[PDB]
Design a binder for these strands. Structure first.
Ligand SMILES: [Cl-]
Ligand SMILES: [Cl-]
Ligand SMILES: [Cl-]
Ligand SMILES: [Mg+2]
Ligand SMILES: [Mg+2]
Ligand SMILES: [Mg+2]
Ligand SMILES: [Mg+2]
Ligand SMILES: [Mg+2]
Ligand SMILES: [Mg+2]
Ligand SMILES: [Mg+2]
Ligand SMILES: [Mg+2]
Ligand SMILES: [Mg+2]
Ligand SMILES: [Mg+2]
Ligand SMILES: [Mg+2]
Ligand SMILES: [Mg+2]
Ligand SMILES: [Mg+2]
Ligand code: NA
Ligand code: NA
Ligand code: NA
Ligand code: NA
Ligand code: NA
Ligand code: NA
Ligand code: NA
Ligand code: NA
Ligand code: NA
Ligand code: NA
Ligand code: NA
Ligand code: NA
Ligand code: NA
Ligand code: NA
Ligand code: NA
Ligand code: NA
Ligand code: NA
Ligand code: NA
Ligand code: NA
Ligand code: NA
Ligand SMILES: [Sr+2]
Ligand SMILES: [Sr+2]
Ligand SMILES: [Sr+2]
Ligand SMILES: [Sr+2]
Ligand SMILES: [Sr+2]
Ligand SMILES: [Sr+2]
Ligand SMILES: [Sr+2]
Ligand SMILES: [Sr+2]
Ligand SMILES: [Sr+2]
Ligand SMILES: [Sr+2]
Ligand SMILES: [Sr+2]
Ligand SMILES: [Sr+2]
Ligand SMILES: [Sr+2]
Ligand SMILES: [Sr+2]
Lengths: 115, 145, 246, 119
RNA sequence: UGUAUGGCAAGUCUAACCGGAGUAUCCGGGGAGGCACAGGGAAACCGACAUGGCCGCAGGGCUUGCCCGAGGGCCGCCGU
RNA sequence: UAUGCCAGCUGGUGGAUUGCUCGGCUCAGGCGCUGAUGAAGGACGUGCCAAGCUGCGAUAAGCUGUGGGGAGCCGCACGGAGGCGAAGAACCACAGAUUUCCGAAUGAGAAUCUCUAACAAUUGCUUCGCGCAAUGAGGAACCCCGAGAACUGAAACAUCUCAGUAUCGGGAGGAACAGAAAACGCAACGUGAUGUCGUUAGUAACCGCGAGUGAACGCGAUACAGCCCAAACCGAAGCCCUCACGGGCAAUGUGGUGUCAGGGCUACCUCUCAUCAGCCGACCGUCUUCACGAAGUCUCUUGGAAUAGAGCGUGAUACAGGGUGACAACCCCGUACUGAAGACCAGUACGCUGUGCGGUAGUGCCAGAGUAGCGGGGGUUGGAUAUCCCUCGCGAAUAACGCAGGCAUCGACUGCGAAGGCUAAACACAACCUGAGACCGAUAGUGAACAAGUAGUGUGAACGAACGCUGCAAAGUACCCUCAGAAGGGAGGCGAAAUAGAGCAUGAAAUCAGUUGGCGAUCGAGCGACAGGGCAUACAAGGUCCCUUGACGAAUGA
């Protein structure tokens, strides 16, 4: 059982979006967030640079960390970003909260899941 | 409700027969007893292996890969900007208590670097020279002969 | 956001920008953790005498006299846990660490979040406080630190429609249970926290349920008593500013 | 101290001179104005009015002051025994108020009239 | 040594102790040192894949079987 | 229906339960030696009446002085008699008087007494006389120096482990011990007395290389403080006792100088604010005690009693806690604020007096021996070749020399001067004072809330309990009847309550008396569960239930 009220809300909002709109991604991300913290994603930048492409939103079902270089102009969506991660992404792209990604894209289209 | 909290009424508290949880016999001896007899399993084998050199004749090098230096060049604006020039002795942490500084060659070198350190590996040179640049050995690093 | 400053008569005397920390998302689980730690860290070590019940040469007679193998002395059972006057089997021990640790960042985030909960009028009313305001926290001028009388602070809070909270706290409860015999007979609701800058308000401290604090050291406990976020607070203009870099 | 056990201990085990504070009663409006005090150590000879017991409303002279039991005997505030004898009902000075004082002592009068000390 | 939850994250945590104070709580300071950030070798000593290939779950895409396919799987290759 | 079974009712018995806390338990701060000037401890005394406790000592629950305190008092302990106190008692603080006998116990002996002037015994000084002094014994633990197990662990057991633990002998203090490098050895162009705390690290090291055992340098902190002899060169310039006189000590050396920034001596430069000795002598803080100290005891209702409810009002630098006939900031003590005193810090810091720091050149004048070191045998340690120590034997150099830097020898390099000595502060404990508590709450918590180390057991060493609660106030039951009766009983009186009447709040179960309902002297034993009948039932907190008929109608089904 989760103890964070904000994480509980995010999961509920991800579910509401997958059931209402035409998406399967937000319900898939919700299922990984309901799982234990150790299973959650701890993704560094060097991985988003390798597998992501432009005009396709990167969804991290965990947290983005600041190791490595990111050159690509990508919109990265996560539960949280480290202080350095958010700074390094905003220089070349855009660090967006998963809560914003649900309002901007409720259908969960043109999105890549990275772990 | 924990496991511990549900034990009142169980009699044996999960130990099986009440003839079980007694003394060290239930453990097969106290501590590491029988590590070579009845409980030899998954124990490191008996015996001596090797020797140790005296601690004050032991050198401890401070290591850093080219990948760490190269990934943080734009962030290291507090250092020299050449035609980049960086003294490795100022980058590595715990370089005070260490005997010498060594640059190892793991990863890629995407920039043109002029590195100054006490020691370099064969692969640390190949990657800096092959990506257009030099490797400068310190006056302390003049031990290689 | 903007926070309206009030003078000693309760009239609007300008307004200053409400600092960024008051927009920190309310996180009750983290606030509750910081309070649980503070309350546990002031708890004293205790334990029964290490030799209680062991001061006897009592021996068991063994088999033979139709009696249980219980250590006896002068035909009276002793020492063992099942015996009257015997030792306590697993008693409270002094050696036990009754303190809880907390990461500085996790504790600092809780102080910030508790400070932020103070800026929400609905949370403040949900916590229990009685008041007739829309804007919260109550921001008063630095000339508050110069007040000497308690009755003068009453008048200011009556002018600020925030005195109804002290009427809530003007009722002591005589607790159920033996805490009474140990000096913990009474308890009362927590009312208004007064955060100043130089010295804690000597004038406001005796008000029913009131707590006084300073912006350099105001913690999670005085900001959120019992771990419950949203305390009705009054800040000094300089306190509001100093509580920004926390 | 703050501990109840220690508070009652210090009161019940207080030395004779410290027991004077246990036999103090409040002064009337006129006497509070005249001497600048709220209360006084009740003396045998003072006139007092009962404010709380079954004898509430009655006036009388203080006949005895027992420091040991920390109680006073007031005139006509009695209990009738089985044989018919009228024995005094001990009163706690906290339930009593002083209407008139006995100032035969020069030291009690001096203490009552000075602003630096209290009686 | 696991697990659940929470903070921070290529870092993380302070210990003794110091200052403050509302004086055992609490606020600030303290990174000494620990663990992590490279390994292999008794030692001397040497020192690595920020991805080269193929499958493919979830998810996404399309003109609805076809593409992209993190994680995962099978290999290569690299250090000693 | 006898004996009797089950449940209940009234009354016992019993003392659980609930409520209460004069005691404990634990943590924290402060403080900390006593004794031949006879301690601590014990014995026996001591009161108007006095058995226990407490106090006290033949001046015996007390005497004197100063200060505080105050109209009361004569301890625990509420009696009777009597007495003391305004000539200022009680009570508290400080100081003083007295202070029996045994007790280190010291004139000698002795189960607390006795016999004929006593530092007994061992010492130092010495007027060689017990003339002047010292030691002895105690203390909660802490501290230092010695002696030193075993159960146990290794699943046996011997080395190892338990453990330098338990226990024993000796000894100091308020704290001990340690301590100004013959150091370290991140080997350095580096550190710089010592404890202690954190870490270094379960690392190095030990080990039937099994089980196990286990540092240090360094670093970050705490607190910081460095000095004196021996000898060289001087050579009585000196020291102790005494008011003095005078005496004693001292050439086998008192005293000066000096102490690795080596020193001395010789020749010079300059200078001192170092050091050592001595005088003066706190602030602040901390701990404790004390003085002062705001505001309702108004209305109505209930009550035995407002501290309750409703109404009106007040203080607050004070809404901590306690008391008071029930829930109290404003009734009483206190509490905040301010101020006073004592103790500790501390005879310390600062200040002062005096002395005088240091440098150059020359000089083989001086610089601690059974030592350094080697060997035999043991203990101890992580100490391994490379810990520390004991024992037996052997045994050096002289600064131009010597020791150390984790095997030995020689050289180099770096460090440092052993075999003489002193030393503040930071740290341990908890007797003592004070404070605190998510500790216990009378079979708990101390063995001990009570007569508690009490009663009691044992020749002795030693062992060792149980017992808390009337009531607002004793108003603690007058009078009368009965009786062998201060018994008990009856009647009666008090109180809100006696089913609060003395081990007296509440008053469970086991269980007992009486009694109610059900069963019962022809009948069979896990005592019941589930169904269904009899008989029994005040209210309350449950309100359903029966029969004709009718509607619906699964499986089944005439
Ligand atoms: Cl990654
Ligand atoms: Cl090695
Ligand atoms: Cl060093
Ligand atoms: Mg016990
Ligand atoms: Mg209860
Ligand atoms: Mg007066
Ligand atoms: Mg004798
Ligand atoms: Mg044995
Ligand atoms: Mg064994
Ligand atoms: Mg074996
Ligand atoms: Mg050992
Ligand atoms: Mg060392
Ligand atoms: Mg001299
Ligand atoms: Mg040994
Ligand atoms: Mg007991
Ligand atoms: Mg009773
Ligand atoms: Na068992
Ligand atoms: Na270092
Ligand atoms: Na005992
Ligand atoms: Na039996
Ligand atoms: Na503890
Ligand atoms: Na560090
Ligand atoms: Na019979
Ligand atoms: Na003391
Ligand atoms: Na007596
Ligand atoms: Na005496
Ligand atoms: Na003597
Ligand atoms: Na003599
Ligand atoms: Na065994
Ligand atoms: Na055996
Ligand atoms: Na061994
Ligand atoms: Na009263
Ligand atoms: Na030897
Ligand atoms: Na050395
Ligand atoms: Na009892
Ligand atoms: Na029936
Ligand atoms: Sr089990
Ligand atoms: Sr056992
Ligand atoms: Sr074997
Ligand atoms: Sr470092
Ligand atoms: Sr008395
Ligand atoms: Sr009494
Ligand atoms: Sr930190
Ligand atoms: Sr020093
Ligand atoms: Sr020497
Ligand atoms: Sr009992
Ligand atoms: Sr015997
Ligand atoms: Sr009667
Ligand atoms: Sr049968
Ligand atoms: Sr049908």
């Amino acid at each position: 059982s989760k103890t964070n009220p904000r994480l509980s809300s995010l999961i509920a909002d991800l579910k509401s979006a997958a059931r209402s709109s035409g998406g399967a991604v937000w319900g898939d991300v919700a299922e990984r967030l309901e799982k234990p913290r150790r299973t959650h994603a701890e993704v560094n930048l060097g991985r988003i640079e390798r597998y992501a492409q432009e005009d396709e939103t990167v969804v991290v079902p965990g947290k983005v960390l600041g190791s490595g270089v990111l050159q690509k102009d990508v919109t990265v969506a996560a539960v949280d970003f480290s202080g350095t991660a958010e700074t390094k992404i905003d220089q070349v792209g855009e660090a967006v909260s998963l809560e914003q990604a649900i309002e901007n894209n409720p259908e969960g289209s043109h999105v890549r899941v990275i772990r | 409700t924990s496991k511990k909290k549900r034990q009142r009424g169980s009699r044996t508290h999960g130990g099986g027969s009440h003839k079980n949880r007694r003394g060290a016999g239930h453990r097969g001896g106290r501590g590491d007893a029988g590590r070579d007899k009845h409980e030899f399993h998954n124990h490191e084998p008996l015996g001596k292996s090797g020797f140790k050199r005296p601690q004050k004749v032991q050198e401890e090098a401070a290591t850093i890969d080219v990948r760490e230096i190269d990934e943080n060049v734009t962030l290291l604006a507090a250092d020299d900007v050449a035609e980049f020039r960086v003294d490795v002795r100022d980058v590595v942490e715990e370089a005070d208590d260490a005997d010498y500084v060594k640059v190892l060659g793991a990863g890629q070198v995407r920039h043109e670097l002029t590195l100054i350190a006490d020691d370099f590996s064969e692969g640390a040179r190949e990657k800096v020279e092959g990506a257009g640049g030099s490797v400068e050995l310190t006056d302390l690093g003049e031990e290689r002969q | 956001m903007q926070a309206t400053i009030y003078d000693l008569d309760g009239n609007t005397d300008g307004e200053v920008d409400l600092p960024d920390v008051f927009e920190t998302p309310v996180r009750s689980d983290l606030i509750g953790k910081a309070v649980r730690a503070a309350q546990a860290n002031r708890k004293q070590d205790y334990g029964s005498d290490e030799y209680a019940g062991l001061r006897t040469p009592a021996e068991s007679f063994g088999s033979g006299r139709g009696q249980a193998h219980v250590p006896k002395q002068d035909g009276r059972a002793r020492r063992v846990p099942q015996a009257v006057k015997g030792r306590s089997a697993h008693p409270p021990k002094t050696e036990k660490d009754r303190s809880l640790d907390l990461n500085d960042k996790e504790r600092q985030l809780a102080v910030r979040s508790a400070l932020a909960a103070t800026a929400d009028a609905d949370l403040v009313a949900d916590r229990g406080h009685e008041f007739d305001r829309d804007e919260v926290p109550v921001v008063v001028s630095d000339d508050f630190e110069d007040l000497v009388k308690t009755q003068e602070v009453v008048s200011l809070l009556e002018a600020l429609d925030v005195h109804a909270d002290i009427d809530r706290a003007d009722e002591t409860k005589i607790k159920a249970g033996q805490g009474s015999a140990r000096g913990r007979k009474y308890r009362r609701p927590a009312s208004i926290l007064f955060v100043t800058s130089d010295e804690p308000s000597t004038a406001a401290r005796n008000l029913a349920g009131a707590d006084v604090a300073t912006a350099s050291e105001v913690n999670t406990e005085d900001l959120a008593p019992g771990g419950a976020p949203g305390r009705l607070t009054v800040f000094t203009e300089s306190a509001l500013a100093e509580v920004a870099e926390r | 101290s703050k501990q109840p056990d220690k508070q009652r201990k210090s009161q019940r085990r207080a030395p004779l001179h410290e027991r004077h504070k246990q036999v103090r009663a409040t002064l009337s409006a006129d006497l509070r104005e005249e001497y600048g005090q709220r209360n006084v150590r009740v003396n045998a000879g003072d006139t007092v009015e009962v404010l709380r017991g079954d004898f509430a409303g009655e006036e009388g002279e203080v006949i005895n002051v027992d420091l040991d039991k920390a109680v006073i005997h007031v005139e006509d505030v009695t209990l009738e025994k089985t044989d018919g004898e009228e024995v005094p009902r001990p009163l706690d000075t906290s339930n009593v108020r002083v209407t008139d004082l006995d100032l035969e002592d020069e030291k009690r009068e001096a203490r009552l009239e000075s602003e630096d000390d209290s009686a």
